[PDB]
Every structure is written in structure tokens, then in C-alpha cells.
């Protein structure tokens, strides 16, 4: 049966702290992993506020000290492990710039390329609380010689956004850059329109641009988020729409039509696989067992809201047949139920 | 926006102790409950035995004290209730009979109906330990004058089994009647043929037989378990396939063919639905917004395996629309991530 | 001479077909016959099949129309007779119930109670083909205002087996009622340890409780038995498969059953009319005559079938035929050469 | 399992013609057979006569040519087999002798002794019809150098009668000889007093006589006829009784002192077993699996008497454990109770 069909099973992370979720400490958006002299590196979104978020509709209230939102006053930060599992939470990767440059307000939602050598990070910068009024949160990128640091800034707003009227026109969330072709991949997203989801490719040589959009773009019109990696000599994603148990893997021969390969279950978010060849420019796509996901509800108090990284292990790789992985149905315990109460 | 379409939402019993959940005492299969003179009744398999099932693969070892499976040794109970959420376990209902009566050996998966003044359960009767041989429950009925007891037995193996060769010809599990188009309406199921299990019909005047099957058995194709109740001129319901996220609410104008009318999610197992029209006769069927069912995997260790009841609440009402039951996302807390771990 | 001993004597029946002794057709186990309005009354299992029985060894093989046993796909017929020789099969009695109530796959081995000027039949209850080999067949019963029927089904396991290790656990077979004290005593038969004992059960109401005598077995071996009352208590003839031992025994309160004769051939599936069976008189005539089987109809094992007998005896406290009472047997030669050599 | 304990088999013989059956021919109460240059020899009572026997009530009647019994007008033919099954009449062994030489009138009831190299016959020697009355037929003995003939009368009257008063004054029937202990050990029989049936020993070191009787005759008290056989050290025999099934195996250490060793069913009566060694003086007796007998009720019809001769086989013997003959179970067909029938 079917290389693109698998099951998702979830493991706590070990090593980081989240001042017993207070909701003033939250990790999200973590960077598919790299492996680099027998060191797995992630990068994440992080936040380490006094208080805790203090909703969109009340950006108004923010101020420096107080975020509205959970991936407001973030900066990207960056562990290690041996194993996947246990992470040593190493410090800062990307801080924010000085006011008013871009990201000055937030830094967040990264991911990783390596590229001829160096490392780049991709990530949306903030200029303002989110939620007042609409978001612009162009994409930067900056860039090291180590995946430790340090890194130096490279870019701001390196994907162009489209013209007034394009579906691309506010907005390119989410860069995920891969390589394929010879060139980088980068995929984002964009909402437009009772709003849709698109998902679009921007190409360059260059990791600092320029990068053109693809003239089929919306590559995608439906998932409010995928995750890509090469598989075979295509492009395969995981693609969930946010709330419904309809999640699919999808696959394009050429990186661009897309066509669904399986239907999934309780499928992670923020999905970050880990494949070697994410960069590797194979033609060779050998697909993906383990990676990072995120929970955006951690806390039950949603006034102390915060978010945690955490581990999923799959099946979703032509060098391994296991099949734990491969089970159709799913169980949930009493207590899952008895969570989903009446009013 | 579907008048069949719902979420469900779950809300733990009180008054039903399990001897903490050491697989001593178990409760399943409630019967959908009535209300009579100011207070709900249902019924309901219990277990109460000195040690947990020893297994369905180890039968062999079963004793008059050590039962087989979680519906082995067991006796139709019987609780009343003001509100539906607490309750009080009021005795027994159904005794074993004496051996070599069939049911001598246990007695369960109840559902009541309400006919010409009177109170029958139908149930599923034993007459060794479950996994043994092939199966082999037979429907038995008993009555009464009140739905306290005392009840009278009635009859045995009330519906007929099919022909060798038909797919009936085993088993006539989960019987459950309405009153519909001036006739007892008692639908059932059976396993088949990779092995598909149907749904089929059987109908009378007299509660204690003859039966006879209906034409286009199976009525349904589809489904491990079903429970159905009066919906306008026809008959709506909820039908499961064990293991999976995706259940089906399905109407049949006539009784017997079915067709979709929504896709729900998280539905009750064994769902016993309390409608005030069950067994009225009303040719106009309300709907229903809350009932019993129940969890077989109540214990975290399957070698001391129970089940409990519980009550679920919903919208699947012409007589009232809740906003709240009307959401079509389902949003699980990490720990429900974290509960389907990897080996 | 000893008013319980006797020689017994066969004659054919008249009235009954087999379709040649070809195995499809086969009649056994009768209930003792009962006299109303002038004709006797018997009950026994039919068989009618398109083929005979495959055997128990077999029993995976049976289908729906393929019997495992001589027992298994029966009915139970019924007989009326003015003489009790010429018998006219009148029709079902028993017929099997819908699959899957008990006795669907089959109904068998009968006997006859009349209670309060209703008629009861009691019978084994076979859900799956014998020999399968579970085999569970506890009794039924039927009733009916006439002796033609029509006759409702009264009640499944009517005689409740013992707890598990008792010698009572698996069986009760061949239930047999008489009238006995003012009760119903039901005697009934158990393989165990094998031996083979027969228990006694007892009620007011013929649809039960019957509940077991605290003795049981009340009698401790004799594969098969059969009981009527005489004078104040209760006399039994017991028979071993094979062997050719036969007892008359005697109960003064139908529990406590002393030997009392060693008698001769006697018959199988023995079931002699006795007008005072049910009759509750403390006053038991004994008997002369009744109805027997042979299973061992066919010539050929593959076509198994058994026929109905009558046998003759003179067990009467009413009569002394000295006919009945001589002490020898002599068989011609023919019944020698008929036990031959491999 | 007892070594004389045994069912018997029975086989038609082939090679002896009755006029088929119609009173006129009668072959009784056959010796043992003895085996003599590859050749089964056997000796028998055998009448051919004008008309069947009138009756022992109407010996009155009886003439030269009409026999009272079925052993009166009697000659002791002899005949030769292979197997044991079919048997070539030869012709006379014993003729009648010249009236009024005792046994003119009949020669019947003869028994074999292999002695010193020579063979003789010992029988019964009537001089007038049976019944006439008064029975008087003492035991004659013949001899001869082959099994074939010629035989030359030896004696007559050779076993005393008692004197006036004992059980034994009037009859020594059924005389058999064996050798033991060194001696000519004859049996006989005879019936005393409520009249019963003993059977004596006599004992000679000449087949010619003086035959002196045993001391503690008679040996044995039961038993309408018996047929004896050396076994082990001591004599084995089988005592049978007329009409009832309490026929037994009997054994004596010493060949005197007979006690039960088996309760037997449907045994062969007039019974005549082959034993290599019972003229062998081995004091090591092996038993029996074959030999000879006879039926009296031949013929349906008793105005028409005759006896056929007939095999037996069985298992009482050292020498051979053969199951089919081991079984405690006797079942007849129906025909065997419908011939039991009523007046
Ligand atoms: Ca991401
Ligand atoms: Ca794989
Ligand atoms: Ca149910
Ligand atoms: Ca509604
Ligand atoms: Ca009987
Ligand atoms: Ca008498
Ligand atoms: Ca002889
Ligand atoms: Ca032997
Ligand atoms: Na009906």
C-alpha cells in the first residue's frame, strides 16, 4: 500500500521550561531540524514576557512589556540535541532590531536553509502589536557561517508581495525554503478573497533574492498550513485545514501540481520534518519519520495562553516500513472525550 | 446548517461506582431511557466479578467465576434518574435464569421498548463463555407492568437467524425496537461474508414474536453499530465504524432506506438517545438532544479491562437549535496528542 | 415366580413405512402409549431425510438437509392404534421451531404426561447437528387439550442441569414424568465420572420449577431405564447397552430401588402402557405390553436407521400368563450365524 | 482380560447335504477334530432315515425303519477338511453291529483319543429306541492304525456304572477323553436325584478299561454338558446350561476341582474345540480358537427333527490375544426378537 500514508504519534519534549505554564514563556513555529557535526539545531519562535498574551482585540493595551498576541515580542532562539528528544535550549539566534527596523516588534515563525555552505533563517518581523489594525509581517532573512551563531542580517521583505487585487497582495507567511532544481523553493502562504488559503513558490539563486513568484501560483487553495520536503523527484507536503480531522498528503511530480496521495489523521502542527535531503538537491526524495509540531493550546486559561513545542514520529519514508505507522483507526481514551463539554 | 448534523459533547455519570477501576465491575450497552412518571429509567449490562475478563483467546480458562469477556457473567441492571446526570443504580432488572436456560450464563446489551401499556427488554443471552465457540447470543424478551420490576421472561431467541449461507445466519446482536407505521420496529445487525457488518429489520405485533425479516435486509451496509429513533415521517440514525474519525447520521423516509444527511465527528459509542417519541407512534419525530453510551476502554490496562456509561448531550433536534453543538471544528487538548505514542 | 419377573416377546408393527430400510427414514424413542377414547396414543422421533446419517464422526459435514446422527433433523410424530399392533401415522406433533429457538435443528425422544386432563410432551432440544461435539440438548416441553394437538410450546430447559462438577452438569436425557404422590416425578438420565446415573425431579406444575431430589442419582447405572408405578412405589426395568443383563427393580417410595428380578432380551427404548401412570391411585398394576426400537435396522451401518416395536410381557399384578414366566430363551441357528467370524 | 474369557463366531459348513432340511438326515455331537497328515478328521453322529423321528413320547411306534429320536438308527460317520470350514464326508467310521450286540439298534455321541500311536472312538451303544423307556447306553469303544478306517471293536460297556443308589448308576454319556498326567482322564456325564446333571472323571492307563472312577466324583455339579481341553498344568472347560445364557469357563489345576474362570454368552453347544495338545500329556495346556458343535433345532417344524453340524471360532488360548473375539457386548438384529414371539 501507500508511501504517503501514515499515522503521527506525539512524544513531550525534554528541556525546556515554561514557568509552569504561566503563560509568560511559549515556544512555537520551530525550524524542520538540521544535522550538523551529530547535533540536531532547531529554531523557534520564543517568547519571555511579563504577562501573558492580552489578546488580539485588545492590541490597543499592549505596550513594550505587555504582548497581544502569543507570537507578539518574540525573538527566534535555537537548541541542540543528540536524539531529537532531549533539547539543550542554547540562547538567542535572531534578537530583534533596534526600533523602527523591520522586526523591531517580533520575530518570528523561522525556518532554515543551508545553502553552499552557510545557514540562513527566513522569518516573518513584526512593526506592530498583531491584531491592530491588519498584520504586515514581511518576510527577512539572515545568515551564518554556524549553526550556532553568529548571524548577521541579510534582508528585509524578500518576497515581494503581489499587486493590488493578487491573492498575494498582503501577505507571504510561513517561508519554507527547500531546494529542488538547482535553485531554492520557498513556499508561503497567503489568506484572499469568506476568505481561502493559498499557498504560493517563490524561486531565486540567491538566498538573499531576488526571489520570483511562479506563474502558477496558488500552487495550493485549500490548507491553512503545509509543510514541504522532497520526495522521489517531486515535492510531497503534509496539509491541514485548522479545526477538522481532514488532513492530506499531497505530492507534485514538479514541485507545483499538487495532487492528494492520502488522507490522514490527528496530523501535527507546525509540522517540521527532519530530511537530510531537505537541501541536498537530490532528484531523490527519501521522505521523513520524525520531526517538530507545536500545541497553541497548552494552557486551559485562555487570558494565560501560551504554546509548546513538542515531537511527532511517523512513517512517511521510502527507506522504512514500520507498521506501528501504519494502522487505519484511531482510540481515544475516556478523558478525551470527557473533554469536549456540554455548556 | 443540517438539522442532522451535531456535535457531541460528553459529561462523566454520577451514582455508579467501579471499584476503582480494577476491572471488577463494568457497565455498557445502556438502553436509550424513558421517562416515566417524572423520572428516566435505563438499563444496562453489568458486570460484577471476582477477577477481570481473563480474555476472549483464553475462554477455555473461564469458570463460573472468571468470565471470558466484558459481557461475560453478567445481568441487565437497572437505575432511575431526575436530571440524567446523576443517578441512582436501583438493583436488578434481568437475573440469569437458571442453567440450562439460554441467557443462564450472562444476559446483556438491553433496550427497552414501550407497547400497549407495558415494558419489554430485549437482550442478547448467553449460554457459555464468549470466545469459546463461534458465538451464538440469541435475542431473548422479557416484561413487565412497571419499569421497576419484577419482570417476567418472555421468550427466547425472538428474532429468527437466516438461512446457512445468508448474512444473518449467526446473529442478531444489539436489538433495538421503535414503534413505527403502527408496528414493532426492531433493528439489529450482523456480521458477514474481510468481513462487512449489516443492519437489518425485523418487524411484529406481539412484542413476543413471530418476527419477520424485511426485504432488503441488510437495510444498512455499513456501520459496526447503529441506533436510530423516529425523525419526522421517517427514521434518522447514527451509525459508527469502530477505530475511525468519520460517522455518518443517516434517514430513511420510509424506515428502511437510508441515505446520508451529514458527516459528524466524535460520536458516542453504543449511543442510547433518549426520545420522548421512540415508541408513540407520532408519524413526526422530533429529534433528540441527549442520551446514554459508553466507553469499553475505560481501564489503562487491558489485562483488568472495563467499561463505564456516560451521557453525551447534542443538536440533533427539530424542537430546539443550539448554536453551541452547531461548530464544525474539533480542537484536542496536547494530552490527547501525547496519549498516542510511539513504541 | 416373581411378580416382577417376565420374559418379553417382539411383534412387528403394522403401519409404518421406512422407504424400504433404505436410511433415509427412521422412527425411535416412543413414549409410553396412553388410551383415549378408545384408541392408544404414541409419540416418537421421526426422521425423514433426502439421505441417511453421515455419523458423529462426521458431524462437521452436516448441512441442512444431511443428518449427523439417526436423532438429529427429527420431529416428533404421532400414532393412534385400536389394538396396538396396527398403527395409522397420523402427522407432526413437534414440529422443530424457527432457527434459532431451541430444538430448530432438532426434536427427539418423547414421552407422554397427562395433568389435569391436559396432555404434556417432554422432549430433548438439539440446536446443532450431534456429535459436533458439544452437546447440550436439555428438555422442552408441549402442551395440548387434545391428543391430536394442535400443541403450543410451553417452556426450554424445563429441568435445570447441576453446577459445574456435579454428575448432573451436561445432561438431562430421556425425561421420563410419572404421577407419583400427588407430583410430578420426572426421571431423567446423566453420563458422568463413565457412568450413567438417573435422577429424579419433581413439581407441582408441569411447565416447572422442577426441582432435583436431594438424592440424585437415584439410581446408579443401567445406560437406560424406564419407570411405572406399582402397587405403593415404583418399578424400573434397566438395561446395559450390549450386554445382555437386564434388571426389574423396585422402589417402595420411587428413590430407594432394589433389584428384584434378573430378567432376559428385554427391550430397547422400553415404553409399556400402563392405564394407572398418571393416575396417582398408590396402587401400581404393572404391565403386559408396550412399544420398543431397534437401531440396528439397516444391514449396512452407512444406512442407519432404527424401527418401532411392540414387545409383550406379562410385569402384571392383574394377570399370571405362565406364556411369560418360563425361564429359558432358545434362538435357532440362524441368530448364530448371524454373529460371525472377521 | 482373562485368557478364558471369549465370545464365540460361527460359520456354516460346506459339504454336508440334509435333503434339504426336511427331517430325514441329521449330523450331531461331533468329536474334536484331530489333524492328521496335512488332514482335519471329525467324527459324528449321523442318521439317514425313511421318515424324521416320531418322538421320544412315541418310541412305541418307532420300528427298523422309523427312528423314536434324533440319535436312534444312528451311525458315527467320519469326514476331512483342510480348513476346518469344508469338509468331505468319507463315509462310516462306526457301523451298527449284529442284533443283539449292544449299539444294534444305534451308535451315537462319539469322541476321539490319539493313544500310543493308535486311534480310538468311544460312543454311546443303544439297543432299543430312546424313550422305549428306560435309557441304557453305556460307552463302546473302536480302534484303528489310521484316522480313515478300518476300526475294530474294542469293548463294550468300558466305563462302569454306579452301583444301585449313586448319581452315577444309571449313564455314562458324552464320554471324552484326554490325556493327562499320564493317564487316560474320561469324562462322562449323568443325571441324578429336582433331577440335576453331574459329570465324573474316570480314569485308565489302557484305552481298552478297567476305567476306575475318581473319588470325589462328580467333579463337577452343574452344567447340562461341558467339552474340556488341557490348559496350563491344569483342564480348561466350557459348562453350559440349556435355555439360559449362564454358560462359564471353567478351570481345575489339577483337572478335579473345578472353579469359575469366565461368565461366556451364546456358547456353542455339543462343543467340540481342535487342541493340538490334548493327547500331548504337556502339562502345559495352550487352549483354543476353533472347532466343531451342533444345532438341534434345525429344522423349524419338530415333526420334522434334525441336527446340523457346525464351526466356532473364538480366543482361549495361550497362544493367541485376538481382540474381535474380546468384546463383553452381544448385539442381535431384530429378526433375533421378532422369532421371540408371542402366543
Ligand atoms: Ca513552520
Ligand atoms: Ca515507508
Ligand atoms: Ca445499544
Ligand atoms: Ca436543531
Ligand atoms: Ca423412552
Ligand atoms: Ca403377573
Ligand atoms: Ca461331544
Ligand atoms: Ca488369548
Ligand atoms: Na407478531
New interface residues.
Given amino acids: 500500500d501507500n508511501e504517503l500514508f501514515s ?6 519534549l525534554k528541556g525546556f521550561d515554561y514557568n509552569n505554564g504561566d503563560g509568560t514563556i511559549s515556544r512555537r513555529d520551530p525550524s524542520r531540524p538540521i544535522l550538523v557535526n551529530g547535533k540536531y539545531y532547531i529554531y523557534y519562535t520564543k517568547r519571555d514576557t511579563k504577562v501573558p498574551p492580552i489578546g488580539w482585540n485588545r492590541a490597543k493595551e499592549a505596550t513594550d512589556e505587555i504582548p497581544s498576541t502569543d507570537w507578539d515580542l518574540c525573538e527566534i532562539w535555537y537548541a541542540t540535541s543528540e536524539d531529537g528528544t532531549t533539547w539543550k535550549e542554547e540562547g538567542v539566534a535572531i534578537a530583534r532590531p533596534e526600533k523602527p527596523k523591520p522586526g523591531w516588534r517580533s520575530v518570528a515563525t523561522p525556518d532554515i536553509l543551508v545553502w553552499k555552505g552557510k545557514y540562513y533563517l527566513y522569518y516573518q518581523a513584526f512593526n506592530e502589536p498583531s491584531g491592530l489594525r491588519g498584520d504586515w509581517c514581511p518576510v527577512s532573512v539572515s545568515y551564518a557561517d554556524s549553526p550556532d551563531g553568529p548571524w548577521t542580517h541579510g534582508g528585509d521583505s524578500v518576497i515581494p508581495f503581489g499587486k493590488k487585487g493578487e491573492w498575494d497582495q498582503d501577505a507571504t507567511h510561513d517561508p519554507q525554503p527547500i531546494v529542488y532544481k538547482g535553485k531554492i523553493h520557498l513556499y508561503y502562504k497567503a489568506a484572499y478573497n469568506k476568505y481561502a488559503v493559498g499557498h504560493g513558490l517563490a524561486i531565486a539563486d540567491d538566498p538573499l533574492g531576488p526571489f520570483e513568484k511562479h506563474p502558477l501560483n496558488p500552487v495550493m487553495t485549500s490548507g491553512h498550513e503545509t509543510t514541504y520536503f522532497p520526495f522521489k523527484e517531486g515535492v510531497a507536503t503534509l496539509a491541514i485545514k ?4 481532514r488532513y492530506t498528503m499531497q505530492y507534485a511530480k514538479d514541485g507545483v501540481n499538487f495532487e492528494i496521495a492520502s488522507v490522514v ?2 496530523a501535527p502542527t507546525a509540522a517540521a520534518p527532519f530530511a537530510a535531503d531537505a537541501f541536498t538537491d537530490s532528484g531523490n526524495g527519501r521522505g521523513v519519520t520524525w520531526g517538530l509540531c507545536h ?1 497553541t ?2 494552557s486551559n486559561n485562555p487570558k494565560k495562553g501560551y504554546s ?1 513545542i ?1 515531537r511527532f ?1 511517523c512513517d512517511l519514508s521510502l527507506d522504512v516500513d514500520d507498521p ?1 505507522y501504519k494502522n ?16
Same sequence: chains 1, 2, 4.
Fill in positions: 499515522q503521527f504519534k506525539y512524544t513531550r485548522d479545526g477538522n480531522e489523521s490527528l500545541f493550546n497548552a509548546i513538542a514520529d506501528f487505519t483507526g484511531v482510540w481515544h481514551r475516556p478523558e478525551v472525550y470527557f473533554a469536549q463539554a456540554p455548556r
